[PDB]
Amino acid sequence: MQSLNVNGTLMTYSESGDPHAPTLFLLSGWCQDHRLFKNLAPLLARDFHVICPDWRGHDAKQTDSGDFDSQTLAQDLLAFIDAKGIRDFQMVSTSHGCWVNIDVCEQLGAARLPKTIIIDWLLQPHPGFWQQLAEGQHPTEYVAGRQSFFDEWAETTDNADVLNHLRNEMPWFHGEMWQRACREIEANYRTWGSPLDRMDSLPQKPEICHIYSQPLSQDYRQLQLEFAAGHSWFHPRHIPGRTHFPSLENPVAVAQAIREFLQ
Structure with missing residues (x-):
């Protein structure tokens, strides 16, 4: 649009x-x-x-x-x-x-x-998070780092729309974006605390x-x-x-x- x-x-x-x-x-x-x-x-x-x-x-x-x-x-x-x-x-x-x-x-x-x-x-931030930001940037296994967040972000919901989101919106974007995201988020925490x-x-x-x-x-x-x-x-x-x-x-x-x- x-x-x-x-x-x-x-x-x-x-x-x-x-x-x-x-x-x-x-x-x-x-x-x-x-x-x-x-x-x-x-x-x-x-x-x-x-x-x-x-x-x-x-x-x-x-x-x-x-x-x-x-x-x-x-x-x-x-x-x-x-x-x-x-x-x-x-x-x-x-x-x-x-x-x-x-x-x-x-x-x-x-x-x-x-x-x-x-x-x-x-x-x-907390130890778990910092890790997932690293898992996240791994050129060969960025997915497992992506997935790590999902399991978390989703928790125990039956929610059609949230589930749809973390099955069809987010993972649809490229690995090169998933990674930029991690470098960047990571960067900001390091700057500002x-x-x-x-x-x-x-x-x-x-x-x-x-x-x-x-x-x-x-x-x-x-x-x-x-x-x-x-x-x-x-x-x-x-x-x-x-x-x-x-x-x-x-x-x-x-x-x-x-x-x-x-x-």
Whole structure:
């Protein structure tokens, strides 16, 4: 569908809603699509003008070109807002799409965009994770590293749509993307330490709302309640899912949270 191109290449993007309504971007993780938002978008099309873009290399044409930084993906989106002429807007990002989200909050004003949402971004790395990022980049067995996440991300769901996602969306992309993703995610943790440090180091902080079901850790749920008690620009919202994609597993819940935070 609709596909304005930016910077080095293109990204196909979907549009849903009244253009002259509050503009809201739905941004995926690596190796994901606008189809991540398939359940959530038609709901938000009532209130917002809703754009679900497809990252470099993630279009239906899975287009190559140079490898790239998590920082050029930012650049992509900045050449987007401008190219279409959009001064007022918000964004909601998934997983490691958030690194891009926060970059833009940092590149543009806080004044400019005073609020942002992130979904199921792992706020703190752990030994398991670092491994899977390595398994992930293995030229001959990147699949087993891909698969490792899936088993985890999926947990015990019967959820038709989440299952479909991790059988037909994500593993469909090329090994060369699965790998870039790992180098990149890996790179960001090494730079910032964690999403929490990343955020804590913005000079002017938006109100940030983290929607999330996973990791299924009571400690982790407690860690956010606690970060938030110390940092009032932070607003965790736990959806009780078993899955890594609350936008697929629990679209009614996510829509209501986006709705309420964003006004």
